[PDB]
Amino acid sequence: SMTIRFHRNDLPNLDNYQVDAVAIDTETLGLNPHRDRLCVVQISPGDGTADVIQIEAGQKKAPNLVKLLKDRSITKIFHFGRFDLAVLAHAFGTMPQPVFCTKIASKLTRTYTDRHGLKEICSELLDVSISKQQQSSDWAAEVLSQAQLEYAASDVLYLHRLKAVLEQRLERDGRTKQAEACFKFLPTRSELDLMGWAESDIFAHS
Amino acid sequence: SMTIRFHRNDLPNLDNYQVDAVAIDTETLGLNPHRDRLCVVQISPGDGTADVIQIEAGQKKAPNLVKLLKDRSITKIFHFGRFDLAVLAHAFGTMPQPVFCTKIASKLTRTYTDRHGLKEICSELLDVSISKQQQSSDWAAEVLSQAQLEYAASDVLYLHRLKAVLEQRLERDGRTKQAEACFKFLPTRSELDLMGWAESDIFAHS
Amino acid sequence: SMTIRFHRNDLPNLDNYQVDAVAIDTETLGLNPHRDRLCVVQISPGDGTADVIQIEAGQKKAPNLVKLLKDRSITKIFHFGRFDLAVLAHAFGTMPQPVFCTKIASKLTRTYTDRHGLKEICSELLDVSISKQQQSSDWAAEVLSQAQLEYAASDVLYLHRLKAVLEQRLERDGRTKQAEACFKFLPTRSELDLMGWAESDIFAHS
Amino acid sequence: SMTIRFHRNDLPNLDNYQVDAVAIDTETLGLNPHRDRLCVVQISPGDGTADVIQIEAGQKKAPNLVKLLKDRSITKIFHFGRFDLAVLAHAFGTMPQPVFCTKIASKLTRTYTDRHGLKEICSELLDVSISKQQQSSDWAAEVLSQAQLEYAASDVLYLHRLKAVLEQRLERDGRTKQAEACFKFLPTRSELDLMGWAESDIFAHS
Amino acid sequence: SMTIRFHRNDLPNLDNYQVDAVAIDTETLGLNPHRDRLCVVQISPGDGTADVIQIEAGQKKAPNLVKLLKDRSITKIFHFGRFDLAVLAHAFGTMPQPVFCTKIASKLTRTYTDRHGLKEICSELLDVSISKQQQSSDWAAEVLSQAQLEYAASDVLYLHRLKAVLEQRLERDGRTKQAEACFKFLPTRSELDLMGWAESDIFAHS
Amino acid sequence: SMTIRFHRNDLPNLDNYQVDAVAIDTETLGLNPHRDRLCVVQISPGDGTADVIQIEAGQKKAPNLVKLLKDRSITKIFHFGRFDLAVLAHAFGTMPQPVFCTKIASKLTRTYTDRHGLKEICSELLDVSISKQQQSSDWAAEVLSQAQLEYAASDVLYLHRLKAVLEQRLERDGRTKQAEACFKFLPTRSELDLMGWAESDIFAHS
Amino acid sequence: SMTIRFHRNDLPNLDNYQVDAVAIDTETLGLNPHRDRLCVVQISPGDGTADVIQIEAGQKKAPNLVKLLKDRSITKIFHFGRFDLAVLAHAFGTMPQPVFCTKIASKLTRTYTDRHGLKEICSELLDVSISKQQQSSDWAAEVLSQAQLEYAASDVLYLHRLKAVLEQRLERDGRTKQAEACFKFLPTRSELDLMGWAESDIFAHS
Amino acid sequence: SMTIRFHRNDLPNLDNYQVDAVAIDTETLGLNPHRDRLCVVQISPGDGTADVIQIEAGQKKAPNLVKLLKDRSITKIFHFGRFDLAVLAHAFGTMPQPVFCTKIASKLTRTYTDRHGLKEICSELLDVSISKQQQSSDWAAEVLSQAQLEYAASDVLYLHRLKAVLEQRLERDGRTKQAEACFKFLPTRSELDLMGWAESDIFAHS
């Protein structure tokens, strides 16, 4: 569609990515990055369109996407980037940075709730209703459905709007600096997950 | 004694602190920094001596100690600094930095155990036996005992040796960079505790 | 509307408050009184109308409201006042007293259920249906919605009726004196929460 | 012995009780006041002696002891009075008041520990070592042993000293008024236990 | 109605109770028999009608009902009689016997499910749909509603049919003798609850 | 019906079972094989039809079914065979082998979900909707309903299709050999359950 | 020794068993009666001697012992008979009755403790110290050690004394009738364990 | 010593390994095989001697040891081999087989205990006392102590004796065939741990 562009392996070029921030999510075969391969990278430049990239089994390279991940002048926006950063670094060898995580930002601003999921925060902060996929999905299937493409695009089409509102909320309640320090540490948090500390809060007493 | 110098309120001067790193621990009336006041700051320059500083109720200033806390050329070493950093910042208004935490370093190197306490790590890494205080102590008492001074000094007399060994272990097992990123975030972790997130892992999914 | 009067900062006068009891609830940015500021005070004189007062960030005074909180001849009615008392005392410096808590009264009379929420008790005791807000709300927003005003008013429009029924039930089942002693202690329970015992039952053995 | 006077049923007179405060503990057949009868009342006037009173099965009266329990000019000191107050009220029909509870006072002062037992607090605050009975005891036996008398006396011989130190600590750390309000509520807390709320914190949200 | 007869205090006579078994349930102010008084006794002779008896506060006698409870030639049927037996014995002084409990019988026959409630078993075994009361009810109210009378009658109108089917099932699967021994012990189980063992399985190892 | 053939005791012949694999499920009186007898064996040759066999109380033999269970050239397919294998071996004396378990295969392929039930996997992998029985069923009843026959047939009508898809998925993700080893062990896992280890993971450390 | 007589298979005669009560315990290969065979029966006539009987694998008969188990004029005393009754009935086909259980009696009298083990109760009630075996024992070994014989005898040498004291305590505290009803049900409790309800309190609500 | 031979990297030859079974244990930097490298392999031919082999960081080959691991005519004995098999396969690329696990064998024979550790089973089955290392050990240190060598040797010096006794016990209690099937599956259990199922019982229902 005009909203969703589908690609195999990689972005074909970076013509749509002359931007200062990109929105990213991924799909995998599960929550264990060492067992469960990367299957889809979905990315948006923030212009109301999304690119959905099917990643093949054994695929080691994605040079155009990786240029964006490495580019320190482009902020990579995620809603809970802790997992996606680990998956992307494990797949292609680059830990993306710098980052903004709308879930960490939500935890530091939406102090009146424990519901920090994407659907809930988009409804509350943006008045945008995104549908949540209910059945489980084999994201490694050779053929992805239009419904799958739409679900993947919905994960990234609104993160720039969400970041804009959350930045205002962080400033209003006085937590911009702490959020930024969390974003600076997040790539290390993801590295530590890959290294074997995924089940440990490294800052806990015991 | 020759090993332990006792002071009221503050260090009398910084003559013993022409160093690149200091070792710090604190004593309080309990684990709630907003309720339980700072009572003692114990600090060592790493030369086999320690200064034990009694902090009065309502004391807002400690200018010589605070110079060290602010000095970015001096690394502040703690064994679990997450609590002490919050207590010190709350008492005197300065978040100490930069820091090295031997407990975080232990968690990243001593992967074969869940025992990361000071007594255990000093025995294993330094062949130094420190006695652990068994009974509870009112650290806000007007008069501190020699036993209390000795317990407080034992917390700081060995942290430079511990840091030296842990740096070697971090290099051997390939985790120096991740440890350093943890140390850079730790002051923010302590700020977040004071701000109201003491019971939350900010990086957890939910 | 005729039922709901909206105000900034404070009641404009006490013309509507020549009464022996007032009904109060609050809205905040969350459940931590030290982190999460007071945002709204909703209050009713018991005449079927409510005042909804928007509290600004950093607001230290609300003299007309505070006159009511201090007035020992006016009983302050809450449904679970433990939290609101702490929030009000923290915001304006006065611990409201005396108080009547319809949730404590419910626990001492409705011995056949564990459901002591406002909606449930209003339905059972008053045959009044109040709608419960389902989505989370930023009560610190500059502009409050009519729906928010209606939710806040619903919290206080029925507490006088609820107190009247619960007083009858307390007398019927013989627990008036014990309830009154609970109400006398409740301001101290709220003070202890602010002081650092919010997670502790002070009367428990261990 | 000169330290311990043994009596059947009641104090023989109040000659030793021309005092402003008495220290009390009890022994029963267990922790359920409705099932497990009162067996012993131990009481001290604070002069370094104790009276140990054996209570018979079915005993409904103890007039000299009850005079002390009713006397509003005599403070009844307990270490955790919540249980003893319920047992005494159930046995003889009078809820003792006013009271001072050294365990509540410990919880409000000894903020650095979770160990609030009598042996621990006597060691820390008084430098007094009391032996703790290790084996279980049938306190309803017709014949009580000297060891049992000594254990019972040890529960009351030091509560006046403990109260004196805890009052100083409450003043030092600013919690005298809150402690006093807890002491005023404690008789109601015990009544509520007898009434059927022994397993419920009446002040909890849910 | 023709199905439901309402009475104050007691059955007016035993004309409808020339039977070998009666079906009984009760309503109280809650689950604590010592705190929560008996409010309603509902009873059926098994002929498709029910008597609903309102019990007053402080009522110590119900001679016609009690004749049935004492009559050893009449089996008292309950669905979970453990509670009702305790409540009835506490109210009127007679422990009813002999008994048949359809919930114990269900546990010994319906080995394929953990759902042993009255509504579920009536649907499965009898093809009878009974409506379950959803809101909480003050059964001590002076005036009981027709809905309350219908709920109470539904508890007893089908227990004879249920017992007939469960007896067949007990015989089919070979557990009649064990069920009967459970029924013989059940009055003691209820006595032990009143005596202070309500929270203990007396047959457990620890 | 043409889809479902009903039999008492055993298959009447093996005319429909000249196949290399059969699909099996069972119904019992519950989850304890020593207490809860086998009641129904449902089996399909994979041709879109099913045989539902009612097993009598005390039935020790089923020679035609048992020929299939013993035939090493016929793979017995189950969705979670651990229970059915134990039940069948206990009833007729033969541990069926070899086996394919679609639930183990699901756990080794559907790494993105914890929902491995038959209804969920048939929907996802086969686009087949099977209805799940909601009420509990006495499968030992003399007369089985058509609904019961349809539920039992639905358990086996699709396992050949499910196995075909799961074999493809096991090959795609590289786990065929591990799945096969699990299938070889499964009969022993079921034997160990019958022997007294039903609640123990024999491979766990402790 | 003079205190302990060892036998293979069975008592050689009943010359020592012309008594009204016997004390019994057993040893097995574990706590699962269906998996773990009976290995030893230890029995005392109450005269300060014990018989220790080694039971062979596959042994189905023990006629002299079984005469005692069946004899309704002989009370079988156990400390926690729930397990031994199941083991004995499973081994030889007779459920022993009538019984007295000193552990149930302890639970109904020693209301001040949760420690109802044999060693603890013998110390408290009898002033008898029995040594507890610390290492695990293969009770199915062909050759039993003298230490094993002494441990087994210690289980039965004191149960008559224990029963005598517990009967006095049951009378003193008014629970003789309830204890007797528990003893009458206990054989059924053991039957229900063998039947498949070992992990269920049959009298619980859910 | 004569009992313990130390080697770097690998066995120097297989002169001592002309045997049908070898006993193996390992030391690592922790319990995560992907993070925590293999540090020591200890192995015994069963002749009362042991070889302790220090494995270097990054060591990919150990050809003499690997010959033994691959040799299908040599049974590899472990006490809990699930972990060691994963570690060895991950280090050198060969999954050792066939295997005998004395911990699985203990679980299938020592049905009277939950203590299946090496020290406990050696004491009970062999009357051999092995000392357990109490402090934590950095097994990756360049220099291993004699105490470390002795601890490592103690893990393997007795496994042949243990296997001999456990084989007798498996035969006595009738579980040889089930144990053998467990041993055949164990290499797959270890593979599944490496593949990402270390925290899942693959045979559980859910």
Author numbering:
A (entry chain A), B (entry chain A), C (entry chain A), D (entry chain A), E (entry chain A), F (entry chain A), ...: 0 to 205
Task: Show me the paper's own sentences about this structure.
Orn and NrnC are 3′–5′ exonucleases with a DnaQ fold containing the catalytic DEDD motif, a domain that is common in enzymes that act on nucleic acids. Notably, Orn (and its eukaryotic ortholog REXO2) or NrnC activity is critical for cellular growth, rendering them unique amongst the exoribonucleases known to date. Through quantitative structure-function analyses, we show here that NrnC-type RNases share this narrow substrate length preference with Orn. The structures confirm an octameric assembly as a conserved feature of NrnC-type RNases.
To further understand the structural basis of NrnC’s substrate preference, we determined structures of B. melitensis NrnC (NrnCBm) in several apo and partially pGG-bound states. (C) Superposition of four apo-NrnCBm conformations based on three independent crystal forms (comprising chains apo1A/apo1B for form 1; apo2A/apo2B for form 2, and apo3A/pGG-bound3B for form 3), compared to the pGG-bound conformation of the same protein shown in (B). In contrast, the Y150 side chain points away from the active site in substrate-free NrnC. While the octameric assembly remains in the absence of substrate, this loop moves outward from the active site and D113 rotates away from the substrate. The most drastic conformational change however is attributed to a flexible loop spanning residues 130SKQQQS135. In contrast, in the substrate-free state NrnCBm, captured in the mixed-state structure or a homogeneous apo-state structure, this loop swings away from the active site or is completely disordered, leading to an overall widening of the active site.
